[PDB]
Design an enzyme around this catalytic site. Structure first.
Site, PDB file in Angstrom:
ATOM      1  N   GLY A   3       1.579   0.941 -33.435  1.00  0.00           N
ATOM      2  CA  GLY A   3       1.341   2.309 -33.849  1.00  0.00           C
ATOM      3  C   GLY A   3       1.826   3.346 -32.862  1.00  0.00           C
ATOM      4  O   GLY A   3       2.227   4.440 -33.258  1.00  0.00           O
ATOM      5  N   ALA A   4       1.794   3.028 -31.570  1.00  0.00           N
ATOM      6  CA  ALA A   4       2.222   4.005 -30.579  1.00  0.00           C
ATOM      7  C   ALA A   4       3.678   4.396 -30.779  1.00  0.00           C
ATOM      8  O   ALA A   4       4.022   5.581 -30.711  1.00  0.00           O
ATOM      9  CB  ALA A   4       2.004   3.456 -29.175  1.00  0.00           C
ATOM     10  N   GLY A  31     -20.081  33.796 -16.737  1.00  0.00           N
ATOM     11  CA  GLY A  31     -20.601  34.301 -17.995  1.00  0.00           C
ATOM     12  C   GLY A  31     -19.534  34.509 -19.048  1.00  0.00           C
ATOM     13  O   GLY A  31     -18.490  33.846 -19.055  1.00  0.00           O
ATOM     14  N   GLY A  32     -19.736  35.538 -19.874  1.00  0.00           N
ATOM     15  CA  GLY A  32     -18.862  35.741 -21.015  1.00  0.00           C
ATOM     16  C   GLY A  32     -17.416  35.881 -20.609  1.00  0.00           C
ATOM     17  O   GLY A  32     -16.516  35.433 -21.328  1.00  0.00           O
TER      18      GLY A  32
END
Ligand SMILES: CC(C)(COP(=O)(O)OP(=O)(O)OC[C@H]1O[C@@H](n2cnc3c(N)ncnc32)[C@H](O)[C@@H]1OP(=O)(O)O)[C@@H](O)C(=O)NCCC(=O)NCCS
Ligand SMILES: CC(C)(COP(=O)(O)OP(=O)(O)OC[C@H]1O[C@@H](n2cnc3c(N)ncnc32)[C@H](O)[C@@H]1OP(=O)(O)O)[C@@H](O)C(=O)NCCC(=O)NCCS
Ligand SMILES: *C(=O)CCCC[C@@H]1SC[C@@H]2NC(=O)N[C@@H]21
Ligand SMILES: *C(=O)CCCC[C@@H]1SC[C@@H]2NC(=O)N[C@@H]21
Ligand SMILES: *C(=O)CCCC[C@@H]1SC[C@@H]2NC(=O)N[C@@H]21
Ligand SMILES: *C(=O)CCCC[C@@H]1SC[C@@H]2NC(=O)N[C@@H]21
Lengths: 506, 170, 506, 170
Positions: free
Chosen positions: C400-401, C165-166
């Site tokens: 581009g890399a 949950g939260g």
């Protein structure tokens, strides 16, 4: 939904019609009526109308009253934003619980964040016992927020009813405290403990009433006939003050002229050196329309302090008062003026000083009371200020006093002197009696020497010849010069070393 | 005490406080003398300080006084308490007189209520259960804990808004 | 007193003997044992041992357990101050109530004010239903403090049991999440709701086990065999990190040599251009003692990121990994490396990068998944950094890399390349196919032109001739150069304009 | 929403939020897709902002969602609610099935408990009683309130520590 409207109408009733009738019979307004009377019509926005307390011990769980005894919110006064809260005497006697404190802390924190003034209205009954130690926690947080906001936003407090117990500390750390003359009182420990411990019988009014605290103790800044007068005067005062320590003083269009001359001032100083005069007349001739908001008018009357306007700007005024105690400086006057000057400096309001002081007050009572430190307070306040300072010496300035009252040496910018000023180390009699000690066997030679010393040295021209005075002015022009001077001085800029804060004597 | 605290704070010296206070001094002489502002001076000095503060409650801390003497709420960093501490709104007698005002006539009933209140509420454990006290320590360890706490607290850093200077009640 | 020792000894027992024995039977330690194991002997100081809850609904008032389900305090690890809190599964299932939240917020605030790290250990069961909306309030405050502390003090979280949950949001905002490989899981919504809504049957282990979150979802940074290994590894890691954003990285005395050469590296890169090689071997040959603390080892394995030591100072390393998918950059690799580089830059840790990249991953799937923005994240992180950056182009940088991976143009300070580097706009075949399009029919002429282009442009010396590469180095020298370079770069100082914060593409 | 909020915050533009959220989307698809971090992004963007935030709750705010969407606790300045708002930990049916897990078989008893829970707790008044809501307004007034509120809020100023930049999850 109608049901929500019904909830609202029922929350607005506090503790019942009966208690409201009893409140009215004492001649006092209710909390919400005060809030309505303070703010501009239609501007009030309320927070947290439905909050309830959360204690369940000692049978308290059977009586939950919405609102928990305080009304908080914000609105506008003359178009400028204001935050405020008001304690409600009809709900649990206006006491202070956990949730009550939560609302107060919310409003204080938000008002500090937005940088707006805060008004607090106190009508309390002290600590709710049934809440136990939790109650104390509440008080604590409130105090903290007060101190964080001191010197950042103006905080005004109005006491319109009983305010016993530790709660009293909360309004004492604010900048101004106003009291209502016939229905309010403040004390830390009440008459019962006094009777059981010291065996002295004393009523509440005598112990902590308005008169005691406005005339003898230095707590309250003023008194008013009834609640309406007090609220309207708060509304009036709020137009002088800056909103925060960043923006400048508010400005309005004035109906007066800056170049007018005042013939009457040529005859204010009496011919006989023994007769006094009324300084309040002088001040009310220098201000624009003659409107003057006096602060602590009933305490330490040998000194006068207050707010006026010049050319549409707020100006602070401090002036010695010959009418009472020959204008000497004592402990009370020193503390009064010191705190006022500190406030005026904190928010960048200019200061004008009128000086007529022969010295300090002698007597064993003052010395045993600690006059040294209290006197030093005023010098400390003046010398450290960075706002514009304009001073006018009217009649006398003798000895050390001439140095605390905004002398040129302690950082004043301009120093004028009327033709009647007498600036010397001490009076003619004592000075001669000291310099010619081994001649006092005579009576006529000493008188001749006194006449010659008086003629030569008791004047404003030796001080000017040394350059300590910037100009000798004629009285009839005084106003104009101020109005001009302040203008040029608006751009004063100076910078000091880095300190965490000063170490002012206490 | 206010003057001393401000001096200590100005030059970044840490402060240790030992608390045993039953309240304020009653009487006409003090109120006519202006107790409210003089007492506020101390609260003002304590709440604004930005140095390590460590407080030790030994025996009593009653009423509003417990707040001025460096409580956890006004900015104290650590709060220890000995087992004998009594933290409460006021003494047992007056508290019971106030709460049960509609039955003060008796003398056995009042004594019973007084004993019950004193045993339930005048202890350091009700205040501890609310998180206002960081730990209940054995007295003979006190020095060591101080020596440790200050050692860690050297790095305390916090910043206020921009003010020209404070407005302490003179 | 003895009564105090009895009460305290009974608070150390939690929910009773039976639950402790049940806890031990599953192979999990208790909260206090974890605290005792993490910190140095005799250093633990506990806060708020006796706090109890204050709810009175649904029969909750009949069971008040001291501690309220969380153990909090501070201590020292290797002499350095650390704060920490640990959730206790045996008390109301470690759920989250008002007072619980108050303890957590107190420890977090104190840890931020004194600038020390924070360790959170999680063994909880979520939101306590009986407390109603109040519980939610608690959550909020904790979240807020996390955000205030991010980028000021390092925050570490270790999941050692259920966390649903939260609650799960609280560790998701921390810097590192570690998990235990069989008794932990995380999810926002549990199996029952999932069945009710989508009609799919799944167990908690399959939905949020350690495998899922360490190999698919990117959430967790590592897994360990059992609790003891986890805690010892956390204590190993904590010695790498700076204590806050002002003081430098910790320094210790190294047992290695700053001038040693390693000949084997001359034969690392194979002659055959279709074969891969293991980059992790290179990284472990470059750090001081072959000690490397790998981060997210099992997720997005085409890229390597982690911490090492050079000359006694901590250094971050990022490197391409040929062994999987030929080392291409894709969405997952870009996100992983971007988050890590942002962390390293925030606390002023220098960064070394090893580059071997042929381009981006082709395919419609990546394009529908948003590869453009995930790819831009890494470029953003690299180009905004203001700490020393050193890069080594070991075997390839195409198109581009070569720009995203810390080229001189985007702010790299020093850029070396081995002799085998091939720096070009694209591969030889595609380039020649595009340039010579009028003659695509032939087969011999295309081969001739391809050989020419390859021999003239696929090499590091064209890049050097334009001055994009600072020096070509022999492989066996690499370590020494780095060790020297970093030494000079310690004083890097540079100033950007005034921005509230960047607008990184989320 | 996270990226939009960050852009608005960077350039000092006020933000208004309208909330109607029953929770998060369940299913293996979202979990394998990383719902945890992506959800954290919005919380981060909302809580760090230093501009005016005004929120209006219209119908539903259940569970952890009520906190991500600019709740008072994470830094909202003003929170209003329409009379139809339902602020609870979760839907009434699920809450009853969890609290009364021992008797999940008897239908009528469960329906009665559900009706009690629904009428008492699924409303905007319990949240208000704790002080999380600033005011409950009638819908037709909404515009005016915003128009007024934003005015007073223009001057929001607040100090934070010195960081190079945050470490928001990506
Ligand atoms: C509050 C105080 C200083 C002055 O009280 P007062 O105005 O003269 O009138 P009372 O003595 O009758 O008490 C004030 C009322 O508020 C209530 N009250 C006042 N202070 C209270 C407190 N700290 N806790 C609970 N109730 C309180 C009293 O119950 C009392 O109820 P009442 O309206 O029936 O009279 C005592
Ligand atoms: C921990 C968990 C996964 C199961 O743990 P387990 O080892 O298998 O043992 P149990 O299920 O019987 O739970 C043991 C205790 O933890 C308590 N507990 C666990 N989580 C809780 C919570 N959020 N609120 C209140 N109590 C809780 C239970 O009350 C239970 O008490 P018990 O002694 O009377 O049995 C489960 O408790 C959990 O985390 N959430 C439950 C899911 C839910 O919210 N409702 C149930 C169906 S929707
Ligand atoms: C004439 O008789 C002189 C005696 C009074 C001295 C005056 S009272 C005001 C000043 N205070 C001081 O020290 N001496 C001055
Ligand atoms: C007991 O009978 C004494 C009554 C008050 C207790 C002590 S006397 C001095 C302090 N003043 C006060 O408020 N109470 C304290
Ligand atoms: C040979 O068949 C070439 C096809 C792949 C070209 C390479 S794979 C890695 C890079 N991705 C891309 O866009 N082109 C490069
Ligand atoms: C009734 O049948 C409810 C359906 C499932 C509960 C809903 S689905 C959307 C929200 N997700 C969640 O966590 N529970 C809520």
């Amino acid at each position: 939904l109608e049901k929500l409207e019904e909830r609202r109408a029922q929350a607005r009733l506090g503790g019942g019609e009966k208690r409201l009738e009893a409140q009215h019979k004492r001649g006092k307004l209710t909390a919400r009526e005060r809030i309505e009377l303070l703010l501009d019509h239609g501007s009030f926005e309320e927070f947290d109308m439905f909050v309830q307390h959360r204690s369940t011990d000692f049978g308290m769980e059977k009586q939950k009253i919405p609102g928990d005894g305080v009304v908080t919110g914000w609105g506008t006064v003359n178009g400028r934003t204001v935050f405020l809260f008001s304690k409600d005497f009809t709900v649990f006697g206006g006491s202070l619980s956990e949730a009550h404190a939560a609302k107060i802390v919310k409003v204080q924190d938000m008002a500090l964040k937005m940088r707006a003034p805060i008004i607090g209205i106190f009508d309390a009954g002290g600590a709710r016992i049934q809440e136990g130690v939790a109650a104390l926690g509440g008080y604590g947080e409130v105090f903290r927020r007060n101190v964080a906001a001191s010197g950042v936003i103006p905080q005004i407090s109005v006491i319109m009813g009983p305010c016993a117990g530790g709660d009293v500390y909360s309004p004492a750390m604010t900048d101004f405290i106003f009291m209502v003359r016939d229905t309010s009182y403040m004390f830390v420990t009440g008459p019962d403990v006094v009777k059981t411990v010291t065996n002295e019988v004393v009523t509440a009014e005598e112990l902590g009433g308005a008169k005691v605290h406005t005339s003898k103790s230095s707590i309250a800044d003023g008194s008013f006939e009834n609640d309406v007068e007090a609220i309207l005067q708060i509304r009036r005062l709020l137009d002088f003050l800056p909103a925060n320590n960043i923006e400048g003083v508010p400005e309005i269009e004035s109906f007066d002229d800056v170049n007018r001359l005042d013939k009457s001032l040529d005859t204010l100083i009496p011919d006989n050196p023994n007769k006094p005069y009324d300084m309040g007349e002088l001040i009310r001739r220098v201000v624009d329309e003659g409107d003057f908001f006096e602060i602590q008018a009933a305490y330490a009357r040998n000194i006068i302090t207050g707010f006026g306007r010049v050319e549409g700007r707020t100006v602070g005024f401090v002036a010695n008062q010959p009418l009472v105690l020959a204008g000497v400086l004592d402990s009370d006057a020193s503390r009064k003026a010191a705190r006022f000057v500190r406030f005026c400096n904190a928010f960048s309001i200019p200061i004008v000083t009128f000086v007529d002081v022969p010295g300090f007050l002698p007597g064993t009572a003052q010395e045993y009371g600690g006059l040294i430190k209290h006197g030093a307070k005023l010098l400390f306040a003046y010398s450290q200020a960075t706002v514009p300072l304009v001073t006018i010496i009217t009649r006398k300035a003798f000895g050390g006093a001439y140095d605390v009252m905004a002398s040129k040496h302690v950082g004043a910018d301009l120093n004028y002197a009327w033709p009647t000023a007498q600036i010397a180390v001490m009076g003619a009699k004592g000075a001669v009696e000291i310099i010619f000690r081994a001649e006092i066997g005579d009576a006529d030679k000493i008188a001749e020497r006194t006449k010659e010393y008086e003629d030569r040295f008791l004047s404003p021209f030796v001080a000017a010849e040394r350059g300590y005075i910037d100009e000798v002015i004629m009285p009839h022009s005084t106003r104009k010069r101020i109005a001009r001077a302040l203008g040029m001085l608006r751009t004063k800029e100076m910078e000091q070393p880095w300190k965490k804060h000063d170490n002012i004597p206490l």
